[PDB]
Amino acid sequence: KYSSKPYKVDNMTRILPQQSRYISFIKDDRFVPVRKFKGNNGVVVLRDREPKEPVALIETVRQMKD
Amino acid sequence: VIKFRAGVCEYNEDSRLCTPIPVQGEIEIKPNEEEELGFWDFEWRPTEKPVGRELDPISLILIPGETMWVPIKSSKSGRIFALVFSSNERYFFWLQEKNSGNLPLNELSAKDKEIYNKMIGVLNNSS
């Protein structure tokens, strides 16, 4: 459901397209909402307003060549 | 061509530098993309990941007849392979590996006997 509490896993995993819409990007890091979550979940996108700061950092394989 | 260990990283128009910048790799002296011209192309390619930054100015050209070798006079701790021509067309040569120790009064550096013997020689030849 939705109730607005902590939840066990909320990044990656299997999930569901339907469930992804209940997990919405918090304003409480360097990542800022501007959409209250997009509503789509195929390409992501939270808007980063405080670039190159604390809030994780784990380069993908795309950043080994780009 | 004539291949040598040596990485990319900034040229440093003036001012003894050699920021780390990724660009991990191997150095090749070749005499151009035509492979006969008296200008010498400094070919890089990654063999050591490059931070996803290229750092190659779509080939770097070698002006001919005026190559001094500064191997480490102007030492500043370990190897930065420095290209003197008129001390302003200065090209800067980064260090990713760190093999064969630092050995004294060969370059004054951190990667010495191999890269210096290959380096001087490649510099002198017109072919």
Query: Which residues, 6 or more positions from B69, have their beta carbon under 8 angstroms from its beta carbon?
Result: B83, B84, B119, B120, B123
- Residue A35: Cβ within 10 Å count: 12
A63 contact B CB<8A: yes
- Closest residue in chain A to residue B24, using alpha carbons only: A64
Q: Does A66 touch chain B (CB under 8 A)?
A: yes
Resolution in A: 8.8
Residues with Cβ within 8 Å of residue B5, at least 6 apart in sequence: B26, B27, B96, B97, B99, B111, B114, B115
- Which DSSP helix (H) or strand (E) runs through B2? strand B2-5
Residue in B with minimal Cα distance to A66: B52
A61 touching chain B per CB within 8 A: no
CA-wise closest residue to B81 among B67, B64, B68, B95: B95
Q: What is the DSSP letter of A65?
A: T
With contacts defined as CB-CB under 8 Å, which chain B residues touch A62? Answer: 52
Structure determined via: cryo-EM
Contacts of B24 in chain A (CB under 8 A): none
Q: Do B33 and B61 contact (CB within 8 A), yes or no?
A: no
Strands B26-29 and B42-45: antiparallel
